[PDB]
């Protein structure tokens, strides 16, 4: 019931083409609203609300804080990348591919391709009947984060009675299950 | 474009609770627990490749505490406005009869990062066997959290995820059954 007050620093590194281009943000949030940020592509601190002004003004006046901030892109981001790269950037987990029929209230009325426990997120799930791709007549849950470094999705085809084809970085050739 | 690592922290008053975590593309690498003063890797196997000294993050949070109290006063004590969470419950994988699984309570799109959570089986609170993540960040700067309950699927049990938050007038009671 008491009033609450919240303070989020966010220190982000954005990696492009591997490590060839890096963008570092130092971002500060009072309650929900951002107030002040350092942006590697800008080169100094900027206020984004009037609250963050004295912070931005004062940090800008310090040669060493500014020198440190400008270094982060190399001395922190590129550092950290090389440390975690092995088990994050190069992480690869095979999906498990189930197909079962389902209902939505009637045999019954749609087929479900279930693809679970994969990493990374990027995936291509597609339906086939007799070699032909069924482009229209299918719905999805989208991509779902499980929170444990695996994704899952359900791609459903609505036709009353088939091949599910799953392409993914983890496998050298697409996974099929037939029904 | 392709990869993003964020050092994400907060401090909250008057609860006096802070967090510190690293995030990779929306997944926790690790966090440090203030209470136990130890660094916890999201996957056991991470810790074999990298180190982080917890006492660094503890030092960072002290400053965060200090700084929050400046901004509260600077703002003439304007409180955060509660955004109520959005709860949904799904299974780790396709549900087979009496084949081991995990229920996931997915708590999304909320602020501030305080949440009371209870699993119920058949209306009876489940204390032991539970597991949870810390508060994960979002690009819109709300929070996100996962609760987990491993289980044997059966006709016998119904399950619920009871979530309390200050934005909610009513405790949110999300149902799952076989």
């Amino acid at each position: 019931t008491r009033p609450r007050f919240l303070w989020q620093p966010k220190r982000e590194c954005h990696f492009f083409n591997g490590t060839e281009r890096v963008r570092f943000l130092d971002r500060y949030f009072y309650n929900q609203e951002e107030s002040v940020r350092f942006d590697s592509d800008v080169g100094e601190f900027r206020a984004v609300t009037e609250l963050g002004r004295p912070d931005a003004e004062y940090w800008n006046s310090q040669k060493d804080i500014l020198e440190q901030a400008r270094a982060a892109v190399d001395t922190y981001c590129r550092h950290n990348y090389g440390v975690v790269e092995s088990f994050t950037v190069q992480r690869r987990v095979q999906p498990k591919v189930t197909v079962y029929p389902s209902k939505t209230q009637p045999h019954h009325n749609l087929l479900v391709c279930s693809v679970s426990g994969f990493y990374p997120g990027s995936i291509e799930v597609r339906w086939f009947l007799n070699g032909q791709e069924e482009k229209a007549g299918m719905v999805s849950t989208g991509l779902i984060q499980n929170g444990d470094w695996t994704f899952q999705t359900l791609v459903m085809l609505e036709t009353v009675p088939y091949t599910c084809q799953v392409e993914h970085p983890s496998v050298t050739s697409p996974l099929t299950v037939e029904w | 474009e392709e990869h993003v690592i964020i050092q994400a922290e907060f401090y909250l008053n008057p609860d006096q609770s802070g967090e510190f975590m690293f995030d990779f593309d929306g997944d926790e690498i690790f966090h440090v627990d203030m209470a136990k003063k130890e660094t916890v890797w999201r996957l056991e196997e991470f810790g074999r490749f990298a180190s982080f000294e917890a006492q660094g993050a503890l030092a960072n949070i002290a400053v965060d505490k200090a700084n929050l109290e400046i901004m509260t006063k600077r703002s003439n004590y304007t409180p955060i406005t509660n955004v109520p969470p959005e709860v949904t419950v799904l299974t780790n994988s396709p549900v087979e009869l009496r084949e081991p699984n995990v229920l996931i309570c997915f708590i999304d799109k909320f602020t501030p990062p305080v949440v009371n959570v209870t699993w119920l089986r058949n209306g009876k609170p489940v204390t032991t066997g539970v597991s949870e993540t810390v508060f994960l960040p979002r690009e819109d700067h709300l929070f996100r959290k996962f609760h987990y309950l491993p289980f044997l699927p059966s006709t016998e049990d119904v399950y619920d995820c009871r979530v309390e938050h200050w934005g909610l007038d009513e405790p949110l009671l999300k149902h799952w059954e076989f």
Partner: T-cell receptor, first 105, second 121 residues
Framework: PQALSIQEGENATMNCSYK?????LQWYRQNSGRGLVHLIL?????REKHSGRLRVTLDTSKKSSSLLITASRAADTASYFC????????????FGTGTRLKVLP | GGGAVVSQHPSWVISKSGTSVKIECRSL??????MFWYRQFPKQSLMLMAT?????????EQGVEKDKFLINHASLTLSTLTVTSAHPEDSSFYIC??????????????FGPGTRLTVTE
């Protein structure tokens, strides 16, 4: 280890190579027995840095730094070392091979 | 905080060959999770020898006689290098440094005055 460099009141330029990719590089001077005075630090993104009579080059291409001390006093006589932490590694600083400097009046 | 000095004691040592020698490295203004022991002989440069860490293990650089010394770091302010046996060949300059744990990315460390040990038969 230890290269020797001798002069008068002129400019002194001293070189210091290192074995790994880097984050921070710090220059030190040492007298005899004890000593260890921190002089300056240049970071793996910066090329040039000026402080007092001292000036530091860094060329991460050739993994090499240069220390230029400009109006050399007698009391500049010392060993000059530079120490570096390796990027994506531990906290450790490792010491490069050094130069002994003698400034004669 | 906002500052850092480290103290190394004792400054000079004379021990008989066969006796243990104990050196203390203290951070006074700041806190160290991790400290570093360097050895140096008359002409040559500073060899890093061990890293000490609060709980527990000592690492030891390659290399480097591993456990002809013991390192104890269980203080967050104090790391102890004890040379177990000590012979004339160990007569050296020893010097410790400590990383401020507040520094993070800009990896800030500070050196003690040193210890000037000589062992005689």
């Amino acid at each position: 280890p230890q290269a020797l460099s001798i002069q008068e009141g002129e400019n002194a330029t001293m070189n210091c190579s290192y074995k790994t990719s880097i984050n921070n590089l710090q220059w030190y001077r040492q007298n005899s027995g004890r000593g260890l005075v921190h002089l300056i630090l240049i970071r793996s993104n910066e090329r040039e840095k000026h402080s007092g009579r001292l000036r530091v080059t860094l060329d991460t291409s050739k993994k090499s730094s240069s220390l230029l001390i400009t109006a050399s006093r007698a009391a500049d006589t010392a060993s000059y070392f530079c120490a570096t932490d390796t990027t994506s590694g531990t906290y450790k600083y490792i010491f490069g091979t050094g130069t002994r400097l003698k400034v004669l009046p | 905080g906002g500052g850092a000095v480290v103290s190394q004691h004792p400054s000079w040592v004379i021990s008989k060959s066969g006796t243990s020698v104990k050196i203390e490295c203290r951070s006074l203004d700041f806190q160290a999770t991790t400290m570093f022991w360097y050895r140096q002989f008359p002409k040559q440069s500073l060899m890093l020898m061990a890293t000490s860490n609060e709980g527990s293990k000592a690492t030891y650089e390659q290399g480097v006689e591993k456990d002809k010394f013991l390192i104890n770091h269980a203080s967050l302010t104090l790391s102890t290098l004890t040379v177990t046996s000590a012979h004339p060949e160990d007569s050296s300059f020893y010097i410790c440094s400590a990383r401020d744990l507040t520094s993070g990315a800009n990896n800030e460390q500070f050196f003690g005055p040193g210890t000037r040990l000589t062992v005689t038969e």
